[PDB]
Amino acid sequence: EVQLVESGGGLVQPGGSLRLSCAASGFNIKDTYIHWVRQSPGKGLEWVARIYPTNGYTRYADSVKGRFTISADTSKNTAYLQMNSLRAEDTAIYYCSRWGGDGFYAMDYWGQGTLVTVSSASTKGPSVFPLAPSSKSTSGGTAALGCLVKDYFPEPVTVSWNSGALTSGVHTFPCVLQSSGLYSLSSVVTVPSSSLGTQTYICNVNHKPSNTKVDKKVEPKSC
Amino acid sequence: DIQMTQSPILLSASVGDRVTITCRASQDVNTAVAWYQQRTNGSPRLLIYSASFLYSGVPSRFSGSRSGTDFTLTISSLQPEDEADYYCQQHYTTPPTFGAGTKVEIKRTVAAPSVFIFPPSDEQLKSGTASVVCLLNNFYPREAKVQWKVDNALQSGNSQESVTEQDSKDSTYSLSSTLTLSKADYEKHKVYACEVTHQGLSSPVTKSFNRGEC
Amino acid sequence: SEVTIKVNLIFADGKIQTAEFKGTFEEATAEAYRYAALLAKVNGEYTADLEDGGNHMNIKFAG
């Protein structure tokens, strides 16, 4: 299958530099154009740069010209985006995509995207607290429980339940930005009341920017 | 540069309906227009290219057409999994440019929320802050009012809401409201109450606990 | 300033959809009328009623 995988996004200070990679597989980038496209609150979807690896021709959006460079290493079937002199408005999800693959004159594969956060604030790992089931979180023979993932920076945080085996009834809320400048989110799951105390419930929290991995077991409260 | 003007910005229809969204180029782009879908937490996915041609693997209920500089995307029988954002893109001149997007929501019947409340955990309480979480599960429509009361006094400015997008099976929303206090203030009061107002409820629901009880 | 024009799209078979257009009042107005015209091609002639000083519309299609 055709696959594009971006890597390299992360926190960077205003004025700083970052380098993104786009590793392709299942086709040869010498046969297509490769583009970078970003997506941000202020501009939505916004094309950044393209390169035709066979001849090295490149084009750039006016707003990044001189600050970013696109390149490609065909021997590694990989393309790159050097980003210098970064500004707050460069904060975005950065996607790489192909164009002209198999004669299709559209961007028919996109990577999962990588998040670039331009800010002077520093990394901070979250605290993970249980949302314990109780008489105040049950009705109709089902019971809600969860995990509060509080005070982290920057995005993103991922949550799974029982190493991804538990997905039915899971709601992981979008993170909120607290007035402290730190993010916070909750993930809840609804389960049979009768399973509480026989079935183990664990939220697997990963915050890669701070190398925080937490596997928190959530149980009903003692008394 | 060429701009792509998409309308409506938001469209909400029932399962099975025919929905039509539009995109207008600011000058001639021939047929060099594509349409992308974006689902929650996802990357843009190609649906239609060159104005009218279906990308391989895309359900045939999607279709596109062109009329001069006006382009239309049609979903002939809206499915729950079509709940997503839709973007048009011209590639006729450099820079390629995208429309501002149309958000497509699914209509369904009213459903009142399950309302649950969670005191601060003991772990959190060891270190100076208390978060109180009110949970509204699986309701529709999205509009809802959550008010916090602490010992019967209405709270303002110390709570924050988060809302999921429409669920994959049942097209409902869920919502969390978190009340944040100092540990000191939390232990200074007794009754913590979440009051929920929603179209599916015959009158507002109050879910509360007394700090310290079991 | 920025306004949001809310629209009910009422089809002859009684199905109802809702849509929003945002922009200046004149931009949002022009876009709603243009969208109604386009839908009228497939769904029949439209009439548009304007409650709330124009900020809400009911757009019925003849079928």
Partner: peptide, 12 residues
């Protein structure tokens, strides 16, 4: 509407 980085969805 407003694109939201956390969800990758328009917020209307």
């Amino acid at each position: 509407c407003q694109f939201d980085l956390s969800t990758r969805r328009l917020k209307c």
